[PDB]
Each structure stands twice: as structure tokens, then as C-alpha cells.
Design a binder for this molecule. Structure first.
Ligand code: HEM
Ligand code: HEM
Lengths: 141, 146
């Protein structure tokens, strides 16, 4: 899973967030709308106009869990697991998107925290998101 | 593949400013590090034993250069990819035996590298074009398995 190196990096990089939670998750879910349109299909009830009131609110929702997780990095499940019954049982998110979103996020970061997303921080950061996605989908296994 | 007008002007609107070698040595360097198994194909490159060891190897670095140099050939003739990449879809298929799933990784890693460098310049629209790029090239690369 995540390693001694690993945990400490995700954290060190989640410290330089920062309080930016809002715009970051927000810019990440947007990017994921254009770059990957097929991903809109899940948000019919959603308004998807740049800076749409809603994407705003959901983005600090999505952001606050990634953190939430980062805090209890040592037992992720019961940490996001609840977001498990939602994504898997109700929403039926195609386990493939979880990758798309992870990609846009790791893109947002790379735009603002260039010098800090080094080879090794790229990795770990990707390790982390992969259990995060590996957890929200667990109900598949 | 129907290229749009602002989709080209962008691809090349960014390319012009690209550091083929620098960007070049990273993506490949980030690949060997990011997904370890892919180090299988480059053993002849010598030392790939530590993050450090890798960012320092002049082979990987050297080759890193002709990789994203080839993507440039992708940009310069955005209409004839399946061709400019016919010759190279053989080597990767009949000789090196590389899973298609790995042409796509390198492509998702080119984009992380492109953005890191151009920070805010790499606008969403920007990204849309350039993910459409790696998906195509990537595709033209595997057509030789089919
Ligand atoms: C690490 C990956 C992801 C995380 C951490 C995450 C997080 C969240 C959060 C925090 C919520 C809001 C919880 C609530 O208010 O009930 C949510 C709900 C939702 N998620 Fe995600 N998400 C991820 C990936 C995805 C993917 C891949 C999809 C499918 C494309 C998706 C689609 C949705 C939808 C449609 C909702 C309900 C939003 C609404 O209508 O209010 N999410 N998720
Ligand atoms: C998807 C983007 C890729 C691009 C743009 C690309 C491009 C190229 C090009 C132009 C060559 C010419 C060989 C030479 O210059 O001597 C080459 C060879 C080679 N490719 Fe790639 N290729 C890609 C994918 C991959 C993947 C996924 C792998 C394995 C992980 C790989 C491993 C190799 C190796 C080992 C060689 C020859 C190295 C040597 O014998 O010195 N390539 N590639």
C-alpha cells in the first residue's frame, strides 16, 4: 500500500494545499468536464456552466474528503467508505472515470505546485488516489 | 479524426514553446519511476535502481529526447498520424512487445509534464486538445496489434 515515504509526501503536499480546497477540487471537476465530456453524463441535475454555483459546492465536497482521507491515511476505508454506497450502489460510476478525475487533480496541483510535485511526489500522490478510488469502488468486489 | 481550428492553433500554439529535451527526459523519467514495471524494456539503459539513479541516467535522458521529439512529428502533420506512426507501430508490436495500455500512460504523463511547465497557460481547452493528441498518437501506435 502506501509507504513511510509515501504517507509523509501526500501529507507534505496536502499541507501546501492550501485552504485552496475550494477552487482546486473545483477547477479539477471542471477540467474533467471538458477534457472528458463523457463524464458529464453522471450530472444531469447539475448545472455545468463554468463557475456554476453547484460545481462550486460539490468541489469543496470532493476536496474535503481527499483531505479527510489524508488525515486518517492509515485507515482509508471507514474514512470514505460511506462515499462507497453512494458511488457504487446508487451512482454506478464506471470505475474508469475515477482515473480521469485523479488525472485532472494531479494536473491542477502540477499547475500551482510545480516545484513540489517532483517525481517521487508524483508517485506517492498517485498511490494515495489509487486506494482512494480503490475504496470508493470496493462495493464492486 | 476531425481537427478543429482552435484545436490546431493550440497544439502548435504550445508546441512552439516546448523543451523537447527537458520535458523529454522527465516524462520518460517520470514513467520509469511512476510505473516501475515499464523499466523492463530499458534494462540495456543500465542503472534504473533508484529515483535518483534514474533522473541521472543519460541514456533514459537521451532517449527521453527522441520520444517527445516524435510527438512533435505528430503535431507538425496533425492529419497523417496513422502514417508517420506506421513504421513505429511495428517495432513496439513485433519487436519490443509493449502493451497498448502503456502508450496511454506515457501520454497522460506527457500532459502532466506539459502543464507543470506552462502552469496557468495550459488552459482546459488547451488540455482538451492535448489529451485528444496523446489518445490519437497512442492509438496510431497500436493499430499494428489489430
Ligand atoms: C477520489 C475520487 C472521488 C472522490 C473522492 C469523490 C467524492 C465525492 C464527494 C465528496 C461527494 C459528495 C458527498 C455528498 O454530498 O453526498 C460525491 C458525490 C458524487 N460523486 Fe464523487 N468523487 C470521486 C469520483 C467520482 C467519479 C469518478 C464520479 C463519476 C463520474 C463521481 C460522481 C459523483 C456524483 C454524481 C455525486 C453526487 C453529487 C450530487 O448530485 O450532489 N465521483 N463524490
Ligand atoms: C506512447 C508513446 C510512445 C512514443 C511517442 C514512442 C516513440 C518511440 C520511437 C520514435 C522510437 C524509435 C526507436 C529509436 O529511436 O531507436 C521508440 C523506441 C522504443 N520504445 Fe517507444 N514510444 C512510445 C511508447 C513506448 C512504451 C509504452 C514503451 C514501453 C514502456 C516504449 C519503449 C521503447 C523502447 C525500449 C524503444 C527502443 C529503445 C532502444 O532499443 O534503444 N515505447 N519509441
Amino acid at each position: 500500500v502506501l509507504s513511510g515515504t509515501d504517507k509523509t509526501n501526500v501529507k507534505g503536499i496536502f499541507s501546501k494545499i492550501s485552504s485552496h480546497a475550494e477552487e482546486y477540487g473545483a477547477e479539477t471537476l471542471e477540467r474533467m468536464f471538458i477534457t472528458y465530456p463523457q463524464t458529464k453524463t453522471y450530472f444531469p441535475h447539475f448545472d455545468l456552466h463554468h463557475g456554476s454555483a453547484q460545481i462550486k459546492a460539490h468541489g469543496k465536497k470532493v476536496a474535503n474528503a481527499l483531505i479527510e482521507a489524508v488525515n486518517h491515511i492509515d485507515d482509508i476505508s471507514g474514512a470514505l467508505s460511506k462515499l462507497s454506497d453512494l458511488h457504487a450502489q446508487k451512482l454506478r460510476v464506471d470505475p474508469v472515470n475515477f482515473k480521469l478525475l485523479g488525472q485532472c487533480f494531479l494536473v491542477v496541483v502540477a499547475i500551482h505546485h510545480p516545484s513540489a510535485l517532483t517525481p517521487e511526489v508524483h508517485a506517492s500522490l498517485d498511490k494515495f488516489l489509487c486506494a482512494v478510488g480503490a475504496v470508493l469502488t470496493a462495493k464492486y468486489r | 479524426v476531425q481537427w478543429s481550428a482552435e484545436e490546431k492553433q493550440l497544439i502548435s500554439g504550445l508546441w512552439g514553446k516546448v523543451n523537447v529535451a527537458d520535458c523529454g527526459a522527465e516524462a520518460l523519467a517520470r514513467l520509469l519511476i511512476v510505473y516501475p514495471w515499464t523499466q523492463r524494456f530499458f534494462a540495456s539503459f543500465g542503472n534504473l535502481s533508484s529515483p535518483t539513479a534514474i533522473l541521472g541516467n543519460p541514456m533514459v535522458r537521451a532517449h527521453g529526447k527522441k520520444v517527445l521529439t516524435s510527438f512533435g512529428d505528430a503535431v507538425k502533420n496533425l492529419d497523417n498520424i496513422k502514417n508517420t506512426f506506421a513504421q513505429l507501430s511495428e517495432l513496439h508490436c513485433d519487436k519490443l512487445h509493449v502493451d497498448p495500455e502503456n502508450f496511454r500512460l506515457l501520454g497522460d504523463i506527457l500532459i502532466i509534464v506539459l502543464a507543470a511547465h506552462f502552469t496557468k497557460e495550459f488552459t482546459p481547452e488547451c488540455q482538451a486538445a492535448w489529451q485528444k493528441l496523446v489518445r490519437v498518437v497512442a492509438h496510431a501506435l497500436a493499430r499494428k496489434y489489430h
